[PDB]
Each structure stands twice: as structure tokens, then as C-alpha cells.
Design an enzyme around this catalytic site. Sequence first.
Site, mmCIF file in Angstrom:
data_model
loop_
_atom_site.group_PDB
_atom_site.id
_atom_site.type_symbol
_atom_site.label_atom_id
_atom_site.label_comp_id
_atom_site.label_asym_id
_atom_site.label_seq_id
_atom_site.Cartn_x
_atom_site.Cartn_y
_atom_site.Cartn_z
ATOM 1 N N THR A 173 -3.614 2.376 -4.978
ATOM 2 C CA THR A 173 -4.871 3.117 -5.001
ATOM 3 C C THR A 173 -5.082 3.793 -6.350
ATOM 4 O OG1 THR A 173 -3.806 5.076 -4.056
ATOM 5 C CG2 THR A 173 -4.751 3.474 -2.519
ATOM 6 N N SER B 287 0.831 -1.195 0.000
ATOM 7 C CA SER B 287 0.000 0.000 0.000
ATOM 8 C C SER B 287 0.869 1.250 0.000
ATOM 9 C CB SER B 287 -0.926 0.003 1.215
ATOM 10 O OG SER B 287 -0.201 -0.226 2.410
ATOM 11 N N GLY B 288 0.398 2.286 -0.690
ATOM 12 C CA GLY B 288 1.139 3.520 -0.822
ATOM 13 C C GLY B 288 2.116 3.555 -1.976
ATOM 14 N N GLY C 279 0.654 -8.608 1.216
ATOM 15 C CA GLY C 279 1.677 -9.459 0.651
ATOM 16 C C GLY C 279 2.286 -10.408 1.665
ATOM 17 N N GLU D 45 4.543 -10.689 3.801
ATOM 18 C CA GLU D 45 5.443 -9.885 4.617
ATOM 19 C C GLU D 45 6.415 -10.777 5.379
ATOM 20 O OE1 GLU D 45 3.428 -7.798 7.684
ATOM 21 O OE2 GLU D 45 2.089 -9.463 8.195
ATOM 22 N N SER E 18 0.470 0.624 5.975
ATOM 23 C CA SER E 18 0.172 -0.762 5.646
ATOM 24 C C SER E 18 -1.315 -1.043 5.824
ATOM 25 C CB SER E 18 0.997 -1.701 6.525
ATOM 26 O OG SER E 18 0.953 -1.297 7.883
ATOM 27 N N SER E 19 -1.900 -1.737 4.854
ATOM 28 C CA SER E 19 -3.288 -2.169 4.920
ATOM 29 C C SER E 19 -3.348 -3.644 5.293
ATOM 30 C CB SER E 19 -3.998 -1.937 3.585
ATOM 31 O OG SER E 19 -5.403 -2.005 3.740
ATOM 32 N N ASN F 115 6.080 -0.476 6.206
ATOM 33 C CA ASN F 115 5.289 0.569 5.574
ATOM 34 C C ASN F 115 4.577 1.395 6.634
ATOM 35 O OD1 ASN F 115 3.853 2.213 3.873
ATOM 36 N ND2 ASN F 115 2.473 0.615 3.111
#
Lengths: 183, 183, 742
Positions: free
Chosen positions: C180, C175-176, C443, C445, C220-221, C217
Site C-alpha cells: 500500500t 498485502s501488509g 501471489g 499461495e 490477505s487481499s 497473512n
Amino acid sequence: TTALVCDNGSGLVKAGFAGDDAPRAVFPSIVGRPRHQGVMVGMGQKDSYVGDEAQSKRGILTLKYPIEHGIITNWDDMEKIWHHTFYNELRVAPEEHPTLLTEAPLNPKANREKMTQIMFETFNVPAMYVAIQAVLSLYASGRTTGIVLDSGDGVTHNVPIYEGYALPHAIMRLDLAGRDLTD
Amino acid sequence: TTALVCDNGSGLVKAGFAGDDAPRAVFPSIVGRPRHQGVMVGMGQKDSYVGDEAQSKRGILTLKYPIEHGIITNWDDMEKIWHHTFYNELRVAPEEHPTLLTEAPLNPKANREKMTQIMFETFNVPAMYVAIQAVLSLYASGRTTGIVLDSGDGVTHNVPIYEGYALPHAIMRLDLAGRDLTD
Amino acid sequence: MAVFGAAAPYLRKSEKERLEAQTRPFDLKKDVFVPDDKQEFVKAKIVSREGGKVTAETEYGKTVTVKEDQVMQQNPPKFDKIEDMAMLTFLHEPAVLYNLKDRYGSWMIYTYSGLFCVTVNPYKWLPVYTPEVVAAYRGKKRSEAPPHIFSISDNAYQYMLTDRENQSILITGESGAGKTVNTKRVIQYFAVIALEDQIIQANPALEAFGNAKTVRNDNSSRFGKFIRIHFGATGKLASADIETYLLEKSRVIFQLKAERDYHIFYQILSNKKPELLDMLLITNNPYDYAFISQGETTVASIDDAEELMATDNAFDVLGFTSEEKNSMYKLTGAIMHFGNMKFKGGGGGGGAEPDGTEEADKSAYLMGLNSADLLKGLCHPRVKVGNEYVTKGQNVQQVIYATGALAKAVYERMFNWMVTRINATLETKQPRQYFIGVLDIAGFEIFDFNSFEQLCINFTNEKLQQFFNHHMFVLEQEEYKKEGIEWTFIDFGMDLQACIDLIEKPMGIMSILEEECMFPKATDMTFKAKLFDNHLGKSANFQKPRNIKGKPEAHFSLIHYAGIVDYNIIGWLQKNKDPLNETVVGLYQKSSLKLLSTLFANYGKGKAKKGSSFQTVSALHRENLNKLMTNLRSTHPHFVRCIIPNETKSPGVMDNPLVMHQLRCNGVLEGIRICRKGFPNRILYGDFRQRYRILNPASRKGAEKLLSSLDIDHNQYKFGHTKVFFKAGLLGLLEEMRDERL
Ligand SMILES: Nc1ncnc2c1ncn2[C@@H]1O[C@H](COP(=O)(O)OP(=O)(O)O)[C@@H](O)[C@H]1O
Ligand SMILES: Nc1ncnc2c1ncn2[C@@H]1O[C@H](COP(=O)(O)OP(=O)(O)O)[C@@H](O)[C@H]1O
Ligand SMILES: [Mg+2]
Ligand SMILES: [Mg+2]
């Protein structure tokens, strides 16, 4: 599948599914027969009232307990009790549910042998197991040591367990129970 | 590198890295076995409690000393003791650490040979040495002459040393020790 | 190529430029890759192979020597800058990395990877996304169309129109990094092909309630967002639906030392709105509270003030009123105060009673409940046995676990209700025909301090990878039956399912943990001993841990598709328990607030349910994953991979270890390994003739005669009717003998 936990106990049969927080069915272990003649024609009264229903007709029945002190003394009555528990209370077929049974310490071996034979033949339960009351009581208490005093309606026994190890030579049994208190 | 100084003795194993002021790990030399069956399932009790743990479970274990009088009589138990000392009390792999062992005078040669074989084979220590429990005691006293009386738990002995020259013909051994006093 | 306008260069280079760049010096004998210390590998020239010692001169000028058993060839010029990794003559782990590196050097954003698509986010504006390209692209099939998201999007659209089946797109990335905006442009493409504004307006509520700060991150989502874009009967856009899955609850109560909790609490503590703080009686100091102070207090991730203001504005412009917003804010505040509860064991009894009640009093006032009733329920839960109610005794540990479970459950119900409300608002009255799914998931991680949450994430990623392997195998078999070249029918699933069976199946790590937390006297050492007894030597994936560079701790190590991963047992047992309280739920249903709606329902044939005490986070996760797999398997999947080029914001520069980690976690290496065991190189007979017939100057007989004279072994090739399949070694030998021929 799911496992089925039934406790015959003495004076109170309590059964339910495993993983539940409390038994679903609890009722006295009584078998009643009518002692009068019966005049009305067409109602067709049944010849044997079993379980909590016998309490409703308590005034016209001769209540009999199938078990005196842990030991089963009337096997046909016990079969009726188990059938009522499995069909009219839990409404499940035991053909696909392993059964866990509870039995008190220091009892005749023929008792367990007949119990297992009835479970495997009459009801064709796929599998079954038999456990001791004290170990289960300790399990429910969140403990691994200590001496447990189990006093039901049939028999009162003390069992010491230390670190999950029993002390068979220190197990004590006394036939004084709730029934004697009522008498 | 560093060297490990293990002192098996009898009834008390004490070990620690060389150059330390005092031994790092001290614990009784006993092996405990459960003499009961165990009723609670799922705990997964180990079949042998070794070292100080056995002292906390004395009431449900039978304790055996692997060393009767200096000599080793149960080699599997001694191997368990050594493994526990190397991997739990010290938490150091013996693959890269020389070891110094101690034993009493006038012991069977098979004992020493088998100890050396086990240490080189099972643990694969880079090197090892064996010493008399009396000469080390003399070292620790900052002396170079005199007699030393080493009265342990298994065996007692007197070893006279003058100016660093031992006198084998004057070494005396007596089997009376702390264990006999306890009995 | 003129159709692609001025974005043509980035989309593809011209054939003239390709030919011009083709010719440059390269000696295949001693131009092979070499291991490196700073990176995994470097481009260097080997002077000679002097026994087991070699001298490699790299671009940096180093003369390091490496062992002879880990040397590997390098791509020749004629296959450099290849569009698809499946067609690479030599398939090697760093070869793909270097090809992507030199392709991004020329700014080739999009790349084929067989069934995969590799897309690295550019740091500068590009004309590839101009709507003119979208308008003029229609009419091109995936095969001829160069790499881009539009190719797979159009392919899936064509499949859904013609084959008449649902299609799904799976996006993987951090994410980031542009996920998005990538989803935004994909939905814009769908709209062009025929509610992007609504989706954009509704996102802030979602990431505000679903993201937290982690070491890797800052945004992070965690939850598995999913969007089904429905269409009409005539193949026209109709409406969109949104669902969430696999939301983690452990983050609410337990947080790692260097990580934060969800952004909601930190945002609420923003001082720019004093009205909420004063009407909620919220302590302005985050340190005082227990739930948040355990983790990192704050970082310069994102300014919470304006983000909270934007979320509030988005809610205000949404369909529901401000009383509901106040409701969520006050409920979040109530969730915040459950940590102030304290309990002291009774002097004469085992049961423990409360000591302080001011926090309980204010909380009960907040929910509109009674403090005395709540305290009685927590201390003395009521349970139904047979036909009568009885009271149960609870100690300090059990009541603490119950409070934590209640907080986690109420938060989860809030999030689910919010998702349902957003879906209802977004819903339009168009008919819902076959849909296109879009799936975003966390992912694979990897940390040096992996824990239970990381284990769950890795297990989900491994299951997804196993699904991908099965799908690719099915596609390979379909191609083989189409071409009549059918061999090696062994499925590619069990190889990865061996590790899966050690997690979810009975007697697995998850099942053992679930049983162990039930045992009244379980401890971490006992759990580790049980794991070792039941899996060391007995299983082919459980092995001892490994200690490197002074890692803080390691208890056990598992082998995954991404390599060796070690986990820490400590702390797992305490956080696995999720024992809910029934009487508290009943009280909530009786409440005078909106809360009763979220807790509306909670726990002739006689089915048996599951006891409150017998509730663990691990089981629910598994169940959720199952109810996801039973759905996602119903649609034809498509895969999209996003790779960050570097840790820093500077464009162009790359960090090879980061790219290696991204590739390992994305499973591209697994795809190439699966492809190489078969015949990855397939060429048409026309191309093969026009390129290799000069070797033996002079179609079945001709090809057989040509190959018979090249000393080609029978088992190194498959002789087909339309395409011919060669091994990598055959291609290398052909290249070498072409070089010597010319
Ligand atoms: N509140 C009570 N006070 C006194 N005696 C009780 C109470 N509740 C139950 N009992 C006694 O306990 C007996 C039931 O014992 P029970 O638990 O069924 O034994 P078992 O488990 O062997 O069946 C009854 O006979 C009753 O007399
Ligand atoms: N203060 C004391 N009083 C009486 N007995 C002791 C005392 N200290 C140690 N002992 C005895 O010494 C024994 C330990 O001897 P130890 O030095 O360990 O012999 P070894 O070195 O061969 O193991 C124990 O059995 C204990 O009974
Ligand atoms: Mg009983
Ligand atoms: Mg000694």
C-alpha cells in the site's frame, strides 16, 4: 459454437439451444392446405401453411399431421416443418450448429436412416446425434435409476434404467396416446 | 515391521495384520462384469466390479468366482482380488510387508508356484510363506493333537496331527463343500 | 554520485568502498556451496572431495557430509554484490538468495533481476524517498541509473511519451508488507512528474470489503485491484480510473477451518455502534449465525472498532449521503440472515417447503419484499417455455444452492456498484489520453491443504507468469535482432502452456469438474476416478500425490513453474455450483429499495444464452481472466517484485526458507532458468580487452586470435560486432586462469 436441441415429438415440435432452461420455440407439428378456391386476386395466398400459423387459419385449411405414431409418414411435410423450425422460429443457419434429435424406442430403422440423410444433405448440418426419449427424461429428473413412463401424443412407452444400464428386453411400447384419447 | 495374513479361501477373502484378534477385512471373492451396454453417457462405468461392491450391483452384473475348488482357475481375476485387498480394504502398500498365505492340502504344484511367482513379481513383497489351512486351525484351537475337519466353501478335508507331527498318508480330501450344497 | 545527496549510500556504494571490499580470501576450488539441513544451503569450506564423501566446515562449525552430485560453485569476489542477476557468472538457485542477503546486510534495497525488480521493504526510515532525490533524478536513463522504482517509472514515462503506447506496471507481493505504501509513493512520484489524497481516502472502503484473514497473512487481499492513471494531451496528469477483477465469491459461504470470512461481517458485529445492531435486529452473538461460525470466529489481526469507524468517516466525507450507507449496512445484514433459512421435504411430495419463517419474515421486511412471495419463488421458481410460464420443482439441495448463489451474486453486485460509485466520485473532467496501468494481484499461495480457491489463484498466477515469459522472449529476440546475434528462435511459451492446456482446455480438470457437477449423481470418488482415467499417463503434468511429514490428505499433484502442488478434491463439487434463480431476481427488480439498481439486468439472428442451472464459478473465473488478458495484453508491461525478508518484525534477521518460498512464488528462478539456456553473459569488446588482454600479451582479428589460444570451443560463445556473448563455464575458466596467471 453451440449445440442445437430439437424435439419433433408428436403433435408438438419444441426446439431451442443447448444449455437453456426451456425450449425457445414450441408449436404444433401441423401442415395445412386450403380446400377452397379463393376469389380475391392480388393477395397471393401461399399454397401451404405450416406450424402455429396454421392454427390462425384453422377454419379454411385441412390440417394434416406428418407423423402418426412416432413414424414419419409424410416426408415432405416433415422437411417443411424442419425448415420452418430452423428459419422462421430460431432464425439460425444449421450450417454451423450440431443437432440433437429425439426418437422413440422400437421404430423402423429406415426412419432414423432417412432422418439422418435429410439432416446431412438438405440442411448440411455439420454433425448430428439421435437419442431416446426415456434416457433424456431420466436425465432431466435428476435420477440414475428407476422406470420411466413416457406418454406423449403419439405413443406411450416404459423403459427401466438401473445405474445407467438399460434393460432392452423389458422395454414396453403401447400405441395408445393422446390422439386416441381425443378420438 | 508387521506381517499380513491373507486367507484367500474360496468365496470369502479375509485379511488383516498379524497379531490382531480378528481379521480386519472380510468380503466375498467374486468378480462382476456388466452384461448390458449402458445408455447414460458421462458416468464412466468401470469395466469390472470387484469384491463387496459387486454385491450391491448384483442385478446388472454377472458374477464369477476365481476359485472353483481350492485351486485358482482365472488368474487375472485373482490378481484383481489381491490388488483390491491390498490397496482398498487394507490401504497398505505391500512393498514392506511379508505375507502369509493359506491353501488346502493336495493341490496342484503349478497353483502354488504361480501364486508365489505372481506375489514376488507383481506386488514385490519382501517375503512370503504358504501354510496348510488345517495346521493354522489347529493352532487357533490351543491344541497340539487330534484331527481337524476343515469344511469350507470349495473343499473339505481331514488332517490328523499328533504331538505336532502330521501324518500325510492319512490326510483325506473331499470336493463336497458349501457351493455344492447351494447348488 | 554527488547528485544523489546523502541517500547515495543506500542507492549505491562508492567505488572506493567497492574496491576495498573486493579483496578478501576465496578459493574457487573448495569454497563451493553445500546443502544444509536447517536451511537449503550454507556457506562452508570443503576440506577435500574424498570420493563420494566430503567434509564441509560451515559458519556454525558443523562437519556434515553431503553427496558429491549436488555440489555447486560460489560467486567469486570480483562479481559479488552485482546489481543485475542476469550478469552473474554462475546462475544458481541459492546464489541469488545469498547475494540478496548480503546486499540487504549492506542495505541495498533495490536490485535488478534482468526484466525484474527486487525490492525488500526496509524496517527503518531511509532518505532515498526524500523529494530532493525525485527532483534531481530526472535526466537519467535506466541503464546508467542504479536500481530503484524511479528508474523504471521514468523509463515507462519516456516510452509512453515517445513510442506513443500504453504502459503497465505489475506489482507482486503479500498485502501488509508495504504494498500500500509502495503504491502511495509511486503515485506520489507520478504526481511530482505531473489525487493521491483521494486515493488514500478511498482505499479503506476497498480493503475493508476485499480482504480476509488467512493462515499465511492476517490481511490477505483477494480481488485483483487495478488502477489506470490517465494523462492529458501535453503529457500531464489528468485523472485516475479504478477497476476490480477476479473477486472470489466462495469465501462468502465456505471458509476453511482456520480462516475467517471477509472483514465486513466481523466489523458490523462491533458493539461500539448499538444503533445498527438494534435497528437491524442483529444477534450480537456470532456463534449463532451459520455463515460465520463455520470458520475461525475471531483473531487478533486488527481492531475492528476503529477501522470500522474510519471507514464510516471516509464514506461520510465522500460524495454520497448517509441513507446510502444505511442501505449497504441493511443489505449486508440481509445477506447475513439467509443462513437461518430451513426447509423440510414434503411428507407426500418430493418438493420441500419451509418450516420456520421468522427469519424469512424479518429478511423480507428488510428488503421491503413479501415473505410469502419470496418463499413461493424459492420453492416454486417460474420459467418461460415457448410462450407460456410453468413452475419448476425444487428439492432441499437445489433450494440451498440457489440461496447460496443468490447471496454470492448480491454481494458481488454490491461490490461492483461500490467500485463504480468510487470511480465516479474520483472522476475529474480532464480529458483521458493514454494511461499507465497499475496491477495488484494475489501471489502463488501454497498450502498443505490446497483447495479450489487456491487452484484458481495458482492458475491465474501461472497465466500471468506465462505472459511474462512471452514478453521476456520478445524482448530477447528484439535485442538479438538489434545486435545481429540471432539463434534459438524457439519461443518460450509452450513449455509453460503445456500445464495451462490441462486446465482451461476441453477435457481439462476444470472442464471435467464443470461437467461432473452437472451430472445428477456425481460424487468425489467418481470425480477422482474420471480424472485418473483421463489424465494419468496420458498427460505430462498430471501425476500421483505424495505424502510427507504426515500431511492430512493428498489426492492429486500438478507440476507448475513454482514446483509440485497437491490439491484436495473433497468439497470441490458442492461449492462449484452457482445456480441462480430468475424469479428471485425479478422480485428484486420489483422491490421498493435501491437493490433493484444492482440487479437491473440479469439472466434477425438467434443467439443462445446460458441456462441458470448451467452456472458454475469455474467458468466465470475463466471468462473474467480472459476479459482481463484481452485488455492487459494491449499495453507494454513492467514488473515489480516485493519480497518480505523475515517472518518476524526484527530488522536484519532473515529466514532462508521464507526467502526461498518468496523467490519460488515470484518466478525469479524461472527467469534465471530461461536466461541460462541461452547466453546470459554479454560483455563489450572494450571491457573484455582491458580486462583480459593481459592473458596473451602482444578488433575482430585480435579477439579471434586471443580466443583461439584459450582452447575455447566454438559452441561455447557467440562472436558479435558490438558485444561478445560467453557461457558461464567460459567465465569460470577465464577467472581460474586469471587467478593462476597473477
Ligand atoms: N394439461 C393437460 N391435460 C391433459 N392432456 C394434455 C395436457 N397438456 C397436454 N396434453 C396432451 O399431451 C399431448 C402433447 O404431447 P407431447 O408432450 O407433445 O408428446 P411428444 O413429446 O411425443 O410430442 C397433446 O396432444 C395433449 O392432448
Ligand atoms: N451359519 C451358516 N450356515 C450355513 N452355511 C454357512 C454358515 N456360515 C457359513 N456358511 C457357508 O460357508 C461358506 C464360506 O466358507 P469359508 O469358510 O469362507 O471357506 P473358505 O475359507 O475356503 O473361503 C459360505 O458359502 C456359506 O454358505
Ligand atoms: Mg415426446
Ligand atoms: Mg477355508
